[PDB]
Design a protein around this ligand. Structure first.
Ligand SMILES: Nc1ncnc2c1ncn2[C@@H]1O[C@H](COP(=O)(O)OP(=O)(O)O)[C@@H](O)[C@H]1O
Ligand SMILES: [Mg+2]
Lengths: 388, 97, 293, 51, 97, 102
């Protein structure tokens, strides 16, 4: 019955994969499908070049799929149909899988009397949306994704798996469109909803890390460069050639530093043609961030244009243009005076976290803590008719 | 309005109670009657258009001259004339409510 | 119409059949009215033509039956407002065509009308309500299916500085292709009115962003000379779009307002309250992270 | 109104909440005022525990 | 002045105005074919359109006496002689102000 | 995690009468004369003093003990600094004209 299914795939398979097959016979026979759910999940890590896995999953889709969590049917299948680069085939199989879950659920909600099976339907819509994105039918996925969004907001008891599939899919949509800002924030939402459970690979970490860094550089309102640095994802891979510069570019922006930043930018024109037409953008961007850092870090809030001029290595004419661009973008609110030659800022959007920024805030409260304490004695003492 | 008998405070709106008679006629259109469907009062339909129909389409000409656009028509004549029927025929042309 | 007696002939049709009818059909009647309006366009009496439009009701074109005459009704009106260089009115008339289902539904047919709408909204002067109307089109997704139109419009929707010589050079070959807003012969001289709007935009943006500026700086910002700068500000004070004080020896121009003692300390009233508000919120968030973490 | 409740501070993954009592109290409380329905639970403090 | 400014007088339907009024009414009720309208108008001289509506009813009464659901030409002749006496006696040629 | 909702406390006019007269004190929910309003200024300032201290301390314990970072706290407290008044500005000069008037 299953005997043919497992025996054929052995020959096709690498020898080092032979035991796995035999372990699938074994936990069928024990009638213990707890260990089976783990074994299938494991299979695609060791065999992601070969779609031996997809053919294997077919048998188990139609057998246990209420006698195993449905969460686990979505986890092993996703690796198989994502990396399938025949996407007609992907759509067709997923739609038939959805029809089986819609029949099943009506009797089984009262029959088990402990389990749910409506959870599974949402996730299939997410996989269906991903297949459309790769296929390059970006609009078809997005309107599927919007209807799915509605359902999710009206539930509050939904698994942590559901949110993880939905945000991943939404990120891929903004990466096709190349909306840098939109990508950055929705990929941050994937990172949060990450599960210790297998629903990631080793490949995916390194590739989100590349795409995040690139988006960040080219955002129009990002200043979450320090937030990325401190994050695990980008921390571990800096020792490879691709992610070496990529780290040092991200680092030179965080710190406002021009000597390291400009030296990197020369290399990347030749190296990467993506960053050979954003050359103008990246130089305006470092200067823009530094501008907010210099006035703010001081306890005087109003600052002459001259000091900015040597700092952003630009003359006075561009200083005013930098300042104007920020206000437009809704990053600062304030005034420009070329009469008094002053920039007087009065609203700031949140700064990067760093220990030393913390230190400068903590020292700044000290100054005015003294005044409250000394005044609190004067007023108390004074008054002889406080309740007389 | 509707107000408590416990604290004499207006709690909530009471939308105004429609008076049935005038309300029935606002709701549905009383039209059309045809111009050549009325016989012998045919002149008197036209004469109404000059008073009402002209300044309604364009207040714009009356405003050029500066003389006020003219309104107020008293309908009279022995009963059964069908002047209430003519009220409908005038406003049937304009499609007026 | 072939003949020179188009003057004479224009007049015949308009006198007689302007008067009402009591036994003629509306379909037949409208068709002559458009004709009468077209002839009033050809003569150069647009004062005639504006009356003829409203002597047929706007409410007899909102049926599917007179959906064909809806396209015509709004086509002839455009031209009447277009000659009297009144651009606010042209834009609305064209948005009725766009919303017409035949134009909206077909891919090709929507393109010529939508480019017209954009052109006239941008040549309209920036009102209060103007911002909302250009930001409707902005929200449209069929704005996104042209790229000439896309780049052009976004510049003025958003508050941002964009120099007159960059517009003059770049957008001359792009927009002279489409006729009757920049490539007509009567509308060639609407490139002069492109210049007035960009710089007028430039002055409104600058009003927010500066509060005092020298006149010498401002000549670079608009790229206009000293004489031109002072003059174009002074008219804006008469149309009541800004308040500025303009110093005639080429000194300084201040786009800011005379204030009162009271008003300025109202902002301090708010900064102090909001600062305090933060100290209250902060106080219970600290305790929360203290116990739990 | 009070609910029956216990806690053991050794392991806070241990506590006693009565399942009978809530239903019975809700039924009674719908009679006295029409205002009354369960909209949360109070804690007696003194702090916000992660428990 | 400024409330009513124009006065439109409504008179009676004329000798060929009275003619049209018959036509609307006959259609409105049931009939078996009638054509006597050229004579009936002379009999009905000086009638309001209210009394032309009453006459059709009058013929309607005569017919249901012969046990017919459709108005005969013969009834319409009978109807108009009856209405006519009654019209003069309770007669009104009056104008209201 | 748990989102603070601020509180001010309220009662219907049914309950409130019994509260006002049962109370047999000065009340922090009502006030009398000028004398009580001098009290209020001392009490209101004392609350600021204590509350500021908690903020500094929290900043200390983040860089010493090394409790995890919160950009909710640090972000809100970033705003406080730009909202901050300073001295020597034309604004303070407008306060002094009003102090002479009053
Ligand atoms: N011109 C007419 N054409 C057809 N029916 C008419 C005409 N004039 C009068 N009538 C009839 O007389 C009836 C009564 O007229 P109505 O409008 O109620 O009148 P009034 O206010 O003058 O009493 C009408 O409903 C209609 O049947
Ligand atoms: Mg009447």
């Amino acid at each position: 019955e299953i005997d043919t299914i497992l025996s054929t795939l052995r020959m096709e398979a690498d020898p080092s994969l032979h035991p796995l097959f035999e372990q699938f016979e074994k936990f069928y026979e024990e009638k213990l499908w707890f260990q089976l759910s783990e074994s299938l999940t494991k299979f695609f890590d060791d065999a992601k070049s070969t779609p031996l896995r997809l053919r294997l999953y077919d048998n188990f889709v139609s057998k246990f799929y209420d006698k195993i969590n449905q969460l686990s049917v979505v986890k092993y299948l996703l690796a198989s149909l994502k990396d399938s680069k025949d996407f007609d085939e992907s759509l067709k199989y997923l739609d038939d899988l959805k029809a089986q879950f819609q029949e099943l659920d009506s009797k089984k909600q009262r029959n088990n009397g402990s389990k749910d099976h409506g959870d599974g339907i949402l996730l299939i819509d997410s996989e269906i949306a991903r297949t459309y994105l790769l296929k390059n039918d970006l609009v078809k996925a997005r309107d599927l994704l919007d209807d799915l969004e509605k359902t999710l907001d009206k539930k509050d008891s939904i698994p942590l798996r559901i949110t993880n599939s939905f945000y991943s899919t939404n990120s891929q949509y903004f990466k096709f469109k190349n909306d840098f800002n939109s990508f950055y924030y929705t990929s941050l939402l994937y990172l949060s909803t990450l599960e210790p459970s297998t629903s990631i690979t080793l490949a995916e970490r390194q590739q989100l890390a590349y795409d995040l860094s690139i988006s960040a550089l080219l955002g129009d309102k990002i200043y979450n460069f320090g937030e990325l640095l401190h994050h695990p994802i980008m921390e571990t891979i800096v020792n490879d050639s691709n992610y070496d510069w990529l780290f040092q570019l991200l680092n030179a922006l965080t710190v406002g530093d021009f000597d390291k930043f400009d030296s990197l930018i020369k290399v990347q024109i030749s190296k990467i043609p993506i960053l050979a037409q954003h050359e103008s953008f990246l130089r305006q961007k470092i200067c823009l961030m530094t501008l907010i850092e210099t006035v703010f870090v001081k306890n005087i809030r109003m600052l002459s244009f001259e000091d900015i001029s040597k700092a952003t290595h630009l003359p006075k004419d561009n200083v005013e243009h930098l300042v104007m661009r920020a206000i437009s973008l809704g990053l600062l609110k304030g005034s420009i005076d070329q009469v008094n030659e002053l920039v007087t800022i009065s609203w700031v959007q949140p700064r990067i976290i760093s220990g030393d920024q913390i230190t400068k805030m903590k020292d700044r409260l000290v100054e005015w803590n003294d005044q409250v304490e000394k005044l609190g004695k004067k007023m108390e003492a004074r008054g002889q008719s406080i309740w007389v | 309005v509707t107000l408590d008998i416990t604290t004499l405070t207006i709690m909530r709106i009471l939308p105004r109670e429609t008076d049935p008679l005038v309300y029935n006629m606002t709701s549905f259109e009383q039209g059309e009657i045809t111009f050549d469907g009325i016989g012998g009062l045919t002149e008197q339909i036209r004469e109404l258009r000059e008073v009402i129909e002209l300044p309604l389409k364009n207040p714009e000409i009356f405003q050029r001259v500066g003389i006020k656009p003219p309104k107020g028509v008293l309908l009279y004549g022995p009963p059964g004339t069908g002047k209430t029927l003519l009220a409908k025929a005038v406003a049937a042309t304009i499609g007026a409510n | 119409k072939e003949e020179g007696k188009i003057d004479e002939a224009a007049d015949i049709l308009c006198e007689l059949q302007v008067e009402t009818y009591g036994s003629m059909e509306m379909s037949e009647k409208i068709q002559f009215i458009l004709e009468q309006m077209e002839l009033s366009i050809l003569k150069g009496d647009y004062s005639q033509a504006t009356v003829l439009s409203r002597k047929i009701l706007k409410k007899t074109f909102k049926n599917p039956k007179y959906e064909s005459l809806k396209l015509e009704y709004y086509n002839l009106l455009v031209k009447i407002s277009l000659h009297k260089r009144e651009y606010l009115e042209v834009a609305q008339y064209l948005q009725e065509i766009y919303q017409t289902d035949a134009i909206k539904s077909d891919e090709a047919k929507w393109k010529p009308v939508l480019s017209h709408i954009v052109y006239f909204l941008v040549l309209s002067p920036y009102g209060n309500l103007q911002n909302d109307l250009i930001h409707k089109i902005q929200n449209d997704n069929n704005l996104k299916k042209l790229e000439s139109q896309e780049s052009l419009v976004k510049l003025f929707t958003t508050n941002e500085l964009m120099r007159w010589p960059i517009v003059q050079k770049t957008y001359e070959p792009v927009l002279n292709e489409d006729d009757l807003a920049f490539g007509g012969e009567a509308n060639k001289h609407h490139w002069e009115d492109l210049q007035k709007r960009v710089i007028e935009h430039n002055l409104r943006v600058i009003s927010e962003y500066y509060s005092r500026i020298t006149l010498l700086r401002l000549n670079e910002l608009l790229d206009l000379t000293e004489s031109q700068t002072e003059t174009y500000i002074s008219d804006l004070v008469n149309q009541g779009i800004i308040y500025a004080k303009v110093n005639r020896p080429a000194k300084i121009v201040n786009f800011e307002k005379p204030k009162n003692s009271s008003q300025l300390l109202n902002e301090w009233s708010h900064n102090v309250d909001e600062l305090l508000e933060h100290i209250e919120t902060i106080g219970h968030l600290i305790t929360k992270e203290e116990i739990m973490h | 109104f009070a609910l029956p409740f216990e806690e053991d501070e050794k392991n806070s993954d241990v506590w006693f909440l009565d399942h009978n009592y809530i239903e019975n109290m809700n039924e009674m409380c719908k009679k006295i005022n029409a205002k009354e329905k369960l909209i949360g639970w109070y804690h007696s403090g003194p702090k916000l525990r992660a428990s | 002045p400024g409330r009513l400014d124009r006065k439109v007088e409504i008179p009676l339907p004329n000798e060929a105005g009275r003619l049209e009024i018959f036509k609307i009414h006959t259609a409105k009720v049931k009939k078996t074919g009638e054509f006597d309208f050229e004579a009936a108008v002379k009999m009905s001289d000086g009638f309001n359109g209210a009394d032309i509506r009453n006459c059709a009813t009058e013929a309607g009464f005569f017919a249901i006496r012969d046990d017919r659901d459709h108005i005969n030409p013969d009834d319409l002749m009978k109807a108009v002689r009856k209405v006519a006496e009654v019209k003069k006696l309770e007669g009104t040629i009056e104008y209201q102000k | 995690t748990f989102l603070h909702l601020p509180c001010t406390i309220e009662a219907e006019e049914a309950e409130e009468i019994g509260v006002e007269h049962l109370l047999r004190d000065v009340r922090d929910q009502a006030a009398g004369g000028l004398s009580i309003r001098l009290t209020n200024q001392l009490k209101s300032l004392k609350g600021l003093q204590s509350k500021l201290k908690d903020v500094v301390e929290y900043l200390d314990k983040v860089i010493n003990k090394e409790l995890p970072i919160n950009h909710t706290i640090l972000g809100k407290l970033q705003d406080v600094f730009n909202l901050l008044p300073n001295l020597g500005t034309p604004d303070d000069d407008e306060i002094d004209v009003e102090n002479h008037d009053r």
